[PDB]
Design an enzyme around this catalytic site. Structure first.
Site, mmCIF file in Angstrom:
data_model
loop_
_atom_site.group_PDB
_atom_site.id
_atom_site.type_symbol
_atom_site.label_atom_id
_atom_site.label_comp_id
_atom_site.label_asym_id
_atom_site.label_seq_id
_atom_site.Cartn_x
_atom_site.Cartn_y
_atom_site.Cartn_z
ATOM 1 N N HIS A 16 0.844 -1.183 0.000
ATOM 2 C CA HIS A 16 0.000 0.000 0.000
ATOM 3 C C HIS A 16 0.886 1.241 0.000
ATOM 4 C CE1 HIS A 16 -3.741 -2.210 0.685
ATOM 5 N NE2 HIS A 16 -3.061 -2.958 1.536
ATOM 6 N N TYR A 137 -7.404 38.768 -7.052
ATOM 7 C CA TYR A 137 -8.414 38.416 -8.039
ATOM 8 C C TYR A 137 -8.398 39.362 -9.229
ATOM 9 C CZ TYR A 137 -12.890 37.607 -10.297
ATOM 10 O OH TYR A 137 -13.874 37.345 -11.225
ATOM 11 N N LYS A 141 -7.982 37.985 -12.764
ATOM 12 C CA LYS A 141 -9.105 38.049 -13.698
ATOM 13 C C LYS A 141 -8.647 38.504 -15.074
HETATM 14 N N1 WY8 Z 1 -5.332 -3.848 -1.504
HETATM 15 C C1 WY8 Z 1 -6.644 -4.065 -1.579
HETATM 16 N N2 WY8 Z 1 -7.153 -5.271 -1.267
HETATM 17 C C2 WY8 Z 1 -8.464 -5.466 -1.450
HETATM 18 N N3 WY8 Z 1 -9.382 -4.609 -1.909
HETATM 19 C C3 WY8 Z 1 -8.838 -3.426 -2.206
HETATM 20 C C4 WY8 Z 1 -7.509 -3.073 -2.067
HETATM 21 N N4 WY8 Z 1 -7.297 -1.777 -2.509
HETATM 22 C C5 WY8 Z 1 -8.483 -1.387 -2.902
HETATM 23 N N5 WY8 Z 1 -9.460 -2.334 -2.750
HETATM 24 C C6 WY8 Z 1 -10.857 -2.232 -3.130
HETATM 25 O O1 WY8 Z 1 -10.979 -1.197 -4.089
HETATM 26 C C7 WY8 Z 1 -11.858 -0.155 -3.619
HETATM 27 C C8 WY8 Z 1 -11.342 1.183 -4.084
HETATM 28 O O2 WY8 Z 1 -10.095 1.503 -3.428
HETATM 29 P P1 WY8 Z 1 -9.381 2.833 -3.829
HETATM 30 O O3 WY8 Z 1 -8.106 2.628 -4.540
HETATM 31 S S1 WY8 Z 1 -10.733 4.072 -4.789
HETATM 32 O O4 WY8 Z 1 -9.054 3.565 -2.492
HETATM 33 C C9 WY8 Z 1 -9.803 3.270 -1.301
HETATM 34 C C10 WY8 Z 1 -10.908 4.275 -1.022
HETATM 35 F F1 WY8 Z 1 -10.413 5.573 -1.199
HETATM 36 C C11 WY8 Z 1 -11.247 3.930 0.436
HETATM 37 C C12 WY8 Z 1 -12.471 3.045 0.558
HETATM 38 O O5 WY8 Z 1 -12.702 2.178 -0.565
HETATM 39 P P2 WY8 Z 1 -13.386 0.801 -0.301
HETATM 40 O O6 WY8 Z 1 -12.739 0.061 0.809
HETATM 41 S S2 WY8 Z 1 -15.425 0.984 0.034
HETATM 42 O O7 WY8 Z 1 -13.214 0.057 -1.659
HETATM 43 C C13 WY8 Z 1 -11.909 -0.344 -2.113
HETATM 44 C C14 WY8 Z 1 -11.770 -1.853 -1.970
HETATM 45 F F2 WY8 Z 1 -13.016 -2.466 -2.144
HETATM 46 C C15 WY8 Z 1 -9.947 3.272 0.973
HETATM 47 C C16 WY8 Z 1 -8.935 3.584 -0.118
HETATM 48 N N6 WY8 Z 1 -7.682 2.807 -0.075
HETATM 49 C C17 WY8 Z 1 -7.504 1.466 0.103
HETATM 50 N N7 WY8 Z 1 -6.252 1.093 -0.029
HETATM 51 C C18 WY8 Z 1 -5.573 2.266 -0.309
HETATM 52 C C19 WY8 Z 1 -4.185 2.508 -0.571
HETATM 53 O O8 WY8 Z 1 -3.267 1.695 -0.576
HETATM 54 N N8 WY8 Z 1 -3.945 3.840 -0.821
HETATM 55 C C20 WY8 Z 1 -4.887 4.804 -0.818
HETATM 56 N N9 WY8 Z 1 -6.149 4.617 -0.584
HETATM 57 C C21 WY8 Z 1 -6.440 3.325 -0.338
HETATM 58 N N1 WY8 Z 2 -15.816 37.483 -8.725
HETATM 59 C C1 WY8 Z 2 -15.009 37.675 -7.677
HETATM 60 N N2 WY8 Z 2 -14.901 38.890 -7.107
HETATM 61 C C2 WY8 Z 2 -14.034 39.038 -6.100
HETATM 62 N N3 WY8 Z 2 -13.226 38.125 -5.549
HETATM 63 C C3 WY8 Z 2 -13.362 36.934 -6.141
HETATM 64 C C4 WY8 Z 2 -14.213 36.627 -7.185
HETATM 65 N N4 WY8 Z 2 -14.083 35.296 -7.548
HETATM 66 C C5 WY8 Z 2 -13.170 34.839 -6.729
HETATM 67 N N5 WY8 Z 2 -12.689 35.774 -5.852
HETATM 68 C C6 WY8 Z 2 -11.641 35.596 -4.861
HETATM 69 O O1 WY8 Z 2 -10.740 34.620 -5.342
HETATM 70 C C7 WY8 Z 2 -10.676 33.478 -4.467
HETATM 71 C C8 WY8 Z 2 -10.629 32.230 -5.307
HETATM 72 O O2 WY8 Z 2 -11.957 31.771 -5.630
HETATM 73 P P1 WY8 Z 2 -12.021 30.444 -6.449
HETATM 74 O O3 WY8 Z 2 -12.417 30.592 -7.860
HETATM 75 S S1 WY8 Z 2 -10.212 29.502 -6.189
HETATM 76 O O4 WY8 Z 2 -13.044 29.503 -5.750
HETATM 77 C C9 WY8 Z 2 -13.835 29.915 -4.630
HETATM 78 C C10 WY8 Z 2 -13.539 29.056 -3.415
HETATM 79 F F1 WY8 Z 2 -13.620 27.710 -3.778
HETATM 80 C C11 WY8 Z 2 -14.684 29.563 -2.525
HETATM 81 C C12 WY8 Z 2 -14.411 30.910 -1.906
HETATM 82 O O5 WY8 Z 2 -13.014 31.246 -1.931
HETATM 83 P P2 WY8 Z 2 -12.580 32.579 -1.251
HETATM 84 O O6 WY8 Z 2 -13.740 33.492 -1.113
HETATM 85 S S2 WY8 Z 2 -11.734 32.173 0.599
HETATM 86 O O7 WY8 Z 2 -11.509 33.138 -2.239
HETATM 87 C C13 WY8 Z 2 -11.887 33.593 -3.553
HETATM 88 C C14 WY8 Z 2 -12.144 35.093 -3.510
HETATM 89 F F2 WY8 Z 2 -11.380 35.669 -2.493
HETATM 90 C C15 WY8 Z 2 -15.856 29.598 -3.529
HETATM 91 C C16 WY8 Z 2 -15.238 29.459 -4.914
HETATM 92 N N6 WY8 Z 2 -15.885 30.265 -5.961
HETATM 93 C C17 WY8 Z 2 -16.021 31.621 -6.027
HETATM 94 N N7 WY8 Z 2 -16.599 32.027 -7.128
HETATM 95 C C18 WY8 Z 2 -16.858 30.862 -7.827
HETATM 96 C C19 WY8 Z 2 -17.459 30.654 -9.100
HETATM 97 O O8 WY8 Z 2 -17.915 31.499 -9.863
HETATM 98 N N8 WY8 Z 2 -17.499 29.319 -9.425
HETATM 99 C C20 WY8 Z 2 -17.036 28.322 -8.644
HETATM 100 N N9 WY8 Z 2 -16.489 28.476 -7.481
HETATM 101 C C21 WY8 Z 2 -16.423 29.772 -7.119
#
Ligand code: WY8
Ligand code: WY8
Lengths: 193, 193
Positions: A16, A137, A141
């Site tokens: 892993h 921003y 922008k």
């Molecule tokens: N070795 C294995 N033996 C048997 N079955 C396995 C193994 N690996 C994966 N599976 C199966 O595949 C699915 C997707 O797993 P995925 O890669 S998307 O990551 C999963 C999900 F994010 C989270 C829940 O998932 P869940 O348990 S309900 O389902 C799993 C499982 F059904 C845990 C994550 N996780 C597991 N292991 C690692 C790792 O090593 N690194 C980073 N994340 C890891």
């Molecule tokens: N028009 C604007 N006028 C003035 N300042 C602005 C404007 N736009 C962005 N900023 C500034 O820039 C940073 C990055 O924002 P970013 O795009 S990375 O995503 C942000 C964060 F995930 C979360 C708040 O973030 P936060 O407030 S602490 O910081 C912002 C802000 F400080 C919501 C996300 N979000 C904002 N707008 C949209 C959109 O339209 N679609 C999808 N997600 C959106």
């Protein structure tokens, strides 16, 4: 349960894979509120996480990980236990007094680094992002307005933006045009080397 | 406050963009627990969401959105209100009796579709993913080994995997070899056309 540190060549692709750790088990570290290291209890920080990554053999292993607060200095590989005494992880990364709990955590990014680079940035609160740069921003922008007519090219770089309110991953082509953006709605910090 | 439905040609590049909506405001819809449509109150589902997307002008606008449960049939454009008579969104997408509340939500994906495709799948619980396919883990583990050697080519397709316990986004080359995997630690459903 065995936990091997990537910083000491412990990476094993058949085990892993988590930031900094190759393990024989896959522990869900989201479920812990208190952890123990050398018989000292440490509280898990609520609602703030740490974006950690290991990079081995052109493979990028990144994820938002829980983190616990510890004023003492811990070293890579120190075992991390739960309150029942089972080892659940090893110390991998720290940000001042925050230490990552590496395992199955929150949002994750797995990437093949062939032909691309990846870079990590602290996202200043309130700043916007376009491509490989952050700014106010108003500055962002207009940067977007001028990069809009460009025909997108192939992705060449990934950029991870770690903020207090949101996290983001963006990608850019050779000209710096933003190709794709993902947002994670969680607040976090990056490790401090 | 205006909300224009992308389904009716309402997409405006200068407005805020959300799945199915172009609006003059940017409402954070994670906070609502009860909404109103035509003077009827509906509860927002806790801890499960809807992955919704619109595609306009070679732009993909996808997000994990809150949904409310309602047995009445609602149609695109039906105004959605809070409990104080303020309009916050419009009906965009439905999954049986679940209806998306589009606006600022949880994890999002914004992508320029130039040169690439994107596909959405229902991730069966307990299934694994490699590249463009889902299957039982052991089968998936084999597919990964067979594709391990194949040289990584350009990204040509995105794949959105929506499951009850985790959501994912993968990218693949022409062979189906996996380039990137992003996990969103949220459960969700997909709209049913
Ligand atoms: N070795 C294995 N033996 C048997 N079955 C396995 C193994 N690996 C994966 N599976 C199966 O595949 C699915 C997707 O797993 P995925 O890669 S998307 O990551 C999963 C999900 F994010 C989270 C829940 O998932 P869940 O348990 S309900 O389902 C799993 C499982 F059904 C845990 C994550 N996780 C597991 N292991 C690692 C790792 O090593 N690194 C980073 N994340 C890891
Ligand atoms: N028009 C604007 N006028 C003035 N300042 C602005 C404007 N736009 C962005 N900023 C500034 O820039 C940073 C990055 O924002 P970013 O795009 S990375 O995503 C942000 C964060 F995930 C979360 C708040 O973030 P936060 O407030 S602490 O910081 C912002 C802000 F400080 C919501 C996300 N979000 C904002 N707008 C949209 C959109 O339209 N679609 C999808 N997600 C959106």
């Amino acid at each position: 349960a065995m936990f091997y540190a990537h910083a000491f060549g412990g990476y094993d692709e058949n085990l892993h894979a988590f930031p900094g750790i190759s393990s024989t088990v896959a522990n869900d570290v989201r479920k812990y509120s208190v952890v123990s290291v050398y018989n000292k209890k440490y509280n898990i920080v609520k609602n703030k996480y740490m974006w950690c990554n290991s990079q081995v053999n052109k493979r990028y292993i990144g994820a938002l990980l829980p983190m616990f607060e510890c004023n003492e200095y811990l070293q890579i590989g120190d075992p991390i236990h739960d309150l029942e005494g089972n080892q659940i992880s090893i110390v991998t990364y720290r940000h001042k007094n925050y230490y990552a709990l590496s395992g199955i955590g929150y949002e994750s990014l797995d990437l093949c680094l062939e032909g691309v680079g990846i870079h990590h940035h602290v996202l200043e609160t309130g700043n916007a992002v376009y491509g490989k740069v952050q700014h106010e921003y108003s500055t962002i922008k207009e940067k977007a307005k001028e990069m809009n007519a460009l025909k997108p090219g192939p992705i060449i770089d990934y950029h991870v933006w770690i903020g207090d309110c949101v996290c983001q991953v963006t990608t850019v082509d050779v000209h710096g045009k933003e190709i794709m953006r993902m947002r994670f709605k969680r607040g976090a910090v990056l490790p401090i080397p």
